[PDB]
Write a protein that binds this ligand. Structure first.
Ligand code: 1RZ
Ligand code: CA
Ligand code: CA
Ligand code: CA
Ligand code: CA
Ligand code: CA
Ligand code: CA
Ligand code: CA
Length: 327
DNA sequence: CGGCGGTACTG
DNA sequence: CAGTAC
DNA sequence: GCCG
């Protein structure tokens, strides 16, 4: 775009973070939409009226946008609770969300050392905690490619016809990635089955996977792996890796889901529901509603899902937000 | 005013 | 079930 | 927070 309201969005984002770490998620959702709407606007907002006219912006947000626009900052930023930056710190641990972070706060911890030395930690959070720094860093797009190639090469050693694709921010074209998302399927509709057993064992053998966060290996029909990998060679960081294995008939919906963004996926699914459909990572489904399951519409490609939702195909680089348009 | 995406693990 | 995650 |  070119954010024409940069000075405004900066400040609303601080505020938004604050609700977000305090656990006030709907409020934080509201801020995020407004903020995207400001960023995409053709010009600096100049009037309260013009602010309210924007979908995503109502009275309370227009008051703020205006106050910032005239007076040059936002009072409310100097009343944010002091606990917020601790709650953010604790929430940046993988596996600890706002509840854990609040529990730790009421136990009086205020730093990661208070966490290590005294807090009770789930298995996941202990892993989250020891890799705190590495997991906060975004990786270059090129390290993501090598991670994906590792997973793919290990998969094709078992079956050369297996399809592997990196999704997430990578597929949306970004320069850096918070974590790598790999989608595996097989066009024969069948040989995706039992992959995780073999694939995980192989990736552990040569030391690439260093920890597992979610991986239900008791289940032969396991569909997801969330864990931690590390490319070989000196000084490499530990990275988050997510792998999903799906049947080929689910490929377009899984691809769409895994490409995201999160906000994009939410809006798509909200749209589907407005049309008596249901959109998931597994399928797009018609005639919903206790509720009734409705039937799967076949969707051999992502274009089919867009078409059935009455939208034009959206290129992966333009899937940051649904309500963001224009070539 | 109530709804705000739909689903998969963990414990 | 609540919590966290994708 | 905003929307229907
Ligand atoms: N709450 C969520 C989270 C993710 N998603 C979907 C499924 S996984 C895909 C990408 O999500 P990630 O959290 O890896 O974000 P991105 O890849 O966009 O960015 P970075 O990893 O931060 O580079 O989005 C979702 O539908 N709902
Ligand atoms: Ca509006
Ligand atoms: Ca966390
Ligand atoms: Ca590939
Ligand atoms: Ca991810
Ligand atoms: Ca990602
Ligand atoms: Ca396990
Ligand atoms: Ca309310």
């Amino acid at each position: 775009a070119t954010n024409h309201n940069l000075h405004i969005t900066e400040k609303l984002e601080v505020l938004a973070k604050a609700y977000s770490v305090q656990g006030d998620k709907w409020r934080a959702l509201g801020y995020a939409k407004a903020i995207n709407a400001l960023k995409s606007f053709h010009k600096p907002v100049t009037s309260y009226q013009e602010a309210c006219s924007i979908p995503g912006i109502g009275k309370r947000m227009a008051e703020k946008i205006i106050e910032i626009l005239e007076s040059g900052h936002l009072r409310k930023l100097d009343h944010i609770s002091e606990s917020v930056p601790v709650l953010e710190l604790f929430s940046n641990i993988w596996g600890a969300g706002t509840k854990t972070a609040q529990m730790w706060y009421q136990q009086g911890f205020r730093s990661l050392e208070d966490i290590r030395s005294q807090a009770s930690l789930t298995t996941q959070q202990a892993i989250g905690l020891k890799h705190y720094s590495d997991f906060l860093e975004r990786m270059p797009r090129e390290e993501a490619t090598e991670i994906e190639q590792t997973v793919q090469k290990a998969a094709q050693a078992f079956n050369s016809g297996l399809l592997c694709v990196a999704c997430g921010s990578y597929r949306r074209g970004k320069a850096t990635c918070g974590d790598v998302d790999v989608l595996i399927t097989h066009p024969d509709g069948r040989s995706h089955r039992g992959i995780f057993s073999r694939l995980l064992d192989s990736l552990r053998q040569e030391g690439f996977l260093t920890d597992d966060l979610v991986s239900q290996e008791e289940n032969g029909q396991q569909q997801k792996y969330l864990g931690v990998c590390r490319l070989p060679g000196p000084g490499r960081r530990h990275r988050r890796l997510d792998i999903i294995v799906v049947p080929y008939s689910e490929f377009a919906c899984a691809l769409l889901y895994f490409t995201g963004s999160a906000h994009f996926n939410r809006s798509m699914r909200a749209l589907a529901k407005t049309k008596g459909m249901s959109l998931s990572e597994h399928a797009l489904s018609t005639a919903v509603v206790k509720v009734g399951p409705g039937r799967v519409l076949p969707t051999p490609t992502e274009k089919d899902v867009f078409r059935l939702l009455g939208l034009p195909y959206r290129e992966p680089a333009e899937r940051d937000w649904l309500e963001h348009h224009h070539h």
